[PDB]
């Protein structure tokens, strides 16, 4: 889930 939430998309 770092893909989704380690940056703001």
């Amino acid at each position, epitope marked *: 889930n*770092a*893909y*989704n*939430m*380690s*940056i*703001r998309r």
Partner: antibody
Amino acid sequence: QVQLQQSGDELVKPGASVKLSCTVSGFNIKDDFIHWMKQRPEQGLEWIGRIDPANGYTKYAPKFQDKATMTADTSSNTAYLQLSSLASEDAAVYYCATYGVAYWGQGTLVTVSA
Amino acid sequence: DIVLTQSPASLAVSLGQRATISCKASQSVDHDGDSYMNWFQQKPGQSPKLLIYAASNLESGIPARFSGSGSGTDFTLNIHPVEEEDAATYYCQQTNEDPYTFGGGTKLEIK
């Protein structure tokens, strides 16, 4: 399974340009932005920008807008950082990252000669 | 742009004790009920390693000795207990607004 393999260290002359690479394996780069970071021991970590390899769209931090050019090639699964008009303050370790910003390359050292 | 200020700049901690590192953002890094603050660990010669994302999520592969708290402008990384291998420099990073920015780092030593 995801590996970001960065190119070897470079000694560069003032005024020149250099192009660094970030070869990704275990991940299709069309699937996410690639980010570039700069690190100096005194000034610390800075985000240069990100590129979307699927469409070539780029976003830079203002301080890197006339220094860095990010490109990418999905076919070779490689991203590039070109640094222009090199000066002493460009000597640094440069990192690429993806999967949000979870996975990082090992860094490429750029040294600038006198 | 968002400025991140870490506290302390360095600390020495006894093996087995708790440690906290603080990161304060000059403006909020919240959006839609989430807080876009990451924590990284770096050892010399190595790339930064992601510990915590979106303030409180533990990254896969990272021991549960590490945890994150906070929202808005005020964040903390907690290490419980500290172990020998934790000697490193720790950075916060916000990814809520462009350009992303990093704190100045906190160097942890084990005494």
